[PDB]
Design a protein around this ligand. Sequence first.
Ligand SMILES: Nc1ncnc2c1ncn2[C@@H]1O[C@H](COP(=O)(O)OP(=O)(O)O)[C@@H](O)[C@H]1O
Lengths: 243, 384, 372, 49, 50, 245, 49
Amino acid sequence: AEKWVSEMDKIMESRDNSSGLTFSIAWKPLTAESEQELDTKDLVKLLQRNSKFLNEDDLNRITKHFQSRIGKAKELIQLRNEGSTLHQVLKEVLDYRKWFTFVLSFKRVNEPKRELTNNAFFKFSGGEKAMAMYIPLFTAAYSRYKEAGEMAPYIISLDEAFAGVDENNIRDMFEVVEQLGFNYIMNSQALWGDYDTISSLSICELVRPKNADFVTVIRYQWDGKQRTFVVDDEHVEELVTHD
Amino acid sequence: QTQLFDEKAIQGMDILFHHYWILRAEQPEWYQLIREREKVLRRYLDEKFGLRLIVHQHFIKLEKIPVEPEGWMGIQDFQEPMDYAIFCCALAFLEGKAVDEQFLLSELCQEIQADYPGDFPLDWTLYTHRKSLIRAVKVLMEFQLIRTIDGDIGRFDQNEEQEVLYEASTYSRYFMRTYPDDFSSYQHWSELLKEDWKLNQEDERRKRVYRKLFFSPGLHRLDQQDPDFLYIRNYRNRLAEDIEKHSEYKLHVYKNTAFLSIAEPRQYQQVFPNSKASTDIILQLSKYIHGEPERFKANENGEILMTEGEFEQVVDDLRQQFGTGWAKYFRDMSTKGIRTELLRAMKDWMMAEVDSETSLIRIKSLTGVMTGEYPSDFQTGGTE
Amino acid sequence: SLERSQFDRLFQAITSLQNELENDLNKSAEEYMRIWEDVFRYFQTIRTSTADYIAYINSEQTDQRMQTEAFLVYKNQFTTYLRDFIVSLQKTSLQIQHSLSELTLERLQHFFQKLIEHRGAIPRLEDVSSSTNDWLTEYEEYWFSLRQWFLGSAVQQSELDILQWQTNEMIRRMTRYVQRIGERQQHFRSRKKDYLQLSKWFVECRDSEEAHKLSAVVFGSMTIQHLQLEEATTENLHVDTWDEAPTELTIKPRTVRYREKTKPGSFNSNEQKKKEQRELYLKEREQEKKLIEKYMTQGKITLSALSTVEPFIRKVLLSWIGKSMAAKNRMVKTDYGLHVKVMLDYEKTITLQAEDGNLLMPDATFLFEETR
Amino acid sequence: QRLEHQVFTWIEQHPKLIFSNERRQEIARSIEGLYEENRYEQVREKLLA
Amino acid sequence: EHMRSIPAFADFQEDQLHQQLAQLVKWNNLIARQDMTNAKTIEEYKKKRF
Amino acid sequence: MMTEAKWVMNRAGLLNFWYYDDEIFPFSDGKLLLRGTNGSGKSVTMQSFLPVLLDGKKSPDRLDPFGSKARRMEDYLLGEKEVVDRDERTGYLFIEYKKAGVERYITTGIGMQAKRHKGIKSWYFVITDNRRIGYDFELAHSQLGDRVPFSAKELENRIGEGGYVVHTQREYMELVNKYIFGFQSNEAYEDLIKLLIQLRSPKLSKDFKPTVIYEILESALPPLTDDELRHLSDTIESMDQTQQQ
Amino acid sequence: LPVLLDGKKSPDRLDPFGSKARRMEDYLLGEKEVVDRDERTGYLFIEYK
Ligand SMILES: Nc1ncnc2c1ncn2[C@@H]1O[C@H](COP(=O)(O)OP(=O)(O)O)[C@@H](O)[C@H]1O
């Protein structure tokens, strides 16, 4: 997970975004609720500790920490009357995603880095909001693929594509998706994909009014400037002949 | 942080009902699902039904004790009392074997023969006795009470010399529930029920109604003053709301019957209608009864009374009209055989009763819930 | 009895190898041969140890020994194996795996060549016809075997991982068997009298129905049954089912004369439906586009100019007005391919008239851009 | 099922014979109802047609 | 199995092995136990193995 | 050395699936954008294509946008009973990858048979001989006059020479990775698909604010699969049982 | 409505059923994250002719 976030941050820093803004993300360990336990931060430090520097003493400490965590699991079983099996309590105590937290950060031009809390986000303009929301997701889905081979097609699937982005700025989101080089299947109620940043795109329109049992597909095409219809070569021949 | 009855709890309740028990070694997903909500399930079952949910290391089991036993409830793979006798004797034998102990089929046959309590000895030279033993062993193996070290029991049908090596599995210990007193002091099964309900004096009526609803396909009005049906009438709305909240079912109420319907039955469930051909004739008979209200005017209790002759005449009329579309199994069989088969089917679903004394047929109001017909285009096809 | 220093020795050998590889072949060949000799002597020691130990764990001797006290002997031997062997494996495998991750063939081939030098220095009187490249390949395959043993491969689980997982599986098995011994010893409170009583009861049953009833009372209902219905159609407590409206089903006649299927079924390929639907939908779109065009004046629409308007156009205009204020650029998009810009003047009592009602609203202007 | 396979392997080996989709349905159903509805005569009669 | 592994005795048989093993237990080279605890086939159950 | 020539998705089919009868959506340079009035299938189609065809897992959670258990795969395959008067079907889904700048096509698709609330089979396949469904290959022969989608054995026979047919989701996922994506491990592929599933969840459109991103990412990380914990939980439960006994 | 009909501002009058999901204080202030406010003074008034 740390390697994934590191690659994601490297990619987010290694570009320039049309909104005049740059983002960076980090995955940091949290502090435990109280000192009435072996603080989870110590255990996380030991786990992240480089293998080269590991030693029998650190191994003993880690084993001790895990023993304490399992003792806490049994204690929680007894204290929580929910009657949940020990398996659930273990899966909860040892779930590492709870130990770490994400922290998004943005850096306006020639200004200090800041953490992106909700309140700060709302002060943003529309394009800034869209960039901040849809760069981390796209950059994550792009970082995952970097683990993959060179044959892999970078696929994504967006549902209710970009709903919320002010109608004017969707252009920039499509610009970003174009730059990264994704192949995607996106669906929308009003999106037409006639934005000049889209080099080429295929639009299909579905129609079945309320209860009809057949879906009618009206296949369009796009080339960056105009949206023609599509008539398939074999289907052109058949239509000419079928009259 | 507290538990709530949710999708997982509903799923667990259905799994508990529609199986005898859930084994960890074979149903780990279901066992895990049931256990997590086991607190809520125990609370709900105790408050409303009164059933004892047994949660153990190796299995989870809901001791489904019925309000009034009905034919369909019993182990269906068995067809004669002798099969039940051999099953019980085999269990008694397994009590003598330690866990994972291995015994040969011949030893089991010998012990069953020795213990078999009837006046008439159990003999293996016959075909029928061997078939009964094979059915008993198959049901045993179904519950994983005994595992099979390689061999073949099916050959026992036609080769009494067949041999097999069996293994007593741990579940044999826990199969049968516990009984109140020294169980031997009891003289007839009816005495068991009087005990199992001696523990549920508190709100016996609500548990009674819930058990009848959830277990039986339907709940028939005994008479004009049946207390269970009066209870349901008084609390129709909250009963429906609670049942919808806690399970997939939805309650129905009529003047002479009440039952739970299910909208989307999952794979493991049993429901009516189904594939078996006898249901088709049941639906057709229901429609035929709907079509002559004056001739088959139901009495006040919702029953329709017909004698074997009248029922056979009705079945003949059905064979005349819709018989062209019946399954070839019934199309080739005489009227009386069809009457017997149809009446067995309708008995299983508590659709009708055969009067013990007068041989009079009582068709219960539950039959009229559903009616079926062929598509009109085939019926016109049947005319051609 | 294994030696707890096995992996300690191998780790020391690999540590010296790392130390020298950091010095980058700036030392004699004999040192390299000695280092390699120590490394692979210890590794082969560990390989024999793991082979024997995994054979012990898998032993059918264990499998038959479960049924006795001898399992206790097996338990003691197994716990000794864990305490001496696997604990060292766990303490030292991580560092070993790291070091092996560092040292690939690339970091080693010069060291291989100097090993080859020392090999030539040895007056081997054996059948040494294998070329120096054969010695290089032997050493490379040896080191690749070590790397596979610890780090594994992208296609196979490492030897270390398989060993560890089998060890965990065996530990669960042994603990569960001790649980089973407890169960075997405790529970024995036989029920035989109950079962024989039950058989006596069953044989007294006259027919199958009575026996099934008895089984339900004794063991408990093996299942439940219910009616399938799509909706809670009725609500009337006072009407008998016969007099109520029944639920109608379509019985499939059980003759191929009509239909019966087990193998994959057919579909209709209803292209004519789709053609009709497409043509109708596009005709509606075109007609709406024309109705909008009908009022176009010099490339724009100004409401005050409109005399009387189609109600549909009124609704479209209201939709545009509402949407426009949402976008800061006051640009709008339409399914007709027409970008539309909306400018609003709001000081006006202007009427937009149609067959139904006279709508008073603030005046607007609609420009349409060149989609070309 | 094997007989159906053979019949429709006999058709597809003789390309000069034009079995429309409707006639293929007719033959399919007539085979489907062998000895329950119609003897073989209704199948080979259509092939001969 | 071990006897069959060696090339010289690769063709070994169970009967000769039993003759030699009974001979050995006569010489007290071995401690003999009867295998009544588990089985894998009917014949194995019936056999009073060791 | 050169770089490999990237794959691109240009085609996406259905065959007797849902209310779709025989449709094939083309992609312009790997991109596609469905649209239509709500209730028309703009969501069901995409859910059917992605990520189902990437791994083949069809459990309700994958189809379900909320992550709830609303609808099973069968329900999509057969369609609402109130609309289509059928209770048995065989549907085919497939995607057709093309290597950019070259004329080689690799197909991957799922085959399902469902009988309304009676149990759903499934078989997956992958074609590698450069045949394209609809130009030199077909899934439903016209024999018998109607159109019948191929059954498992017939599909294996026709494909068998040029491609693989498998009957387990694991094998299909390994095949797809091996050919198209070439991940150096199965785990990374699974995490990629988890992130793709998260992107396709609707909390973004409504609660448009950063803390949604934290939930999306946090849900993307792969947790401890129950198998790894199983040894520990089983062993500890057995030991505590022994103590209580 | 019905707030200015009587003046009862309790959550039961605001929620379409009576739940405590939303309260008059937040309606005055506006949600916490969307705005930086923590104090405010407001008015609601209907006019009759
Ligand atoms: N099993 C089902 N249960 C209920 N509705 C279903 C089911 N299967 C399909 N539907 C239909 O799927 C149609 C399309 O749903 P969907 O495409 O997800 O909505 P939208 O296009 O607005 O995103 C709906 O009209 C719905 O009725």
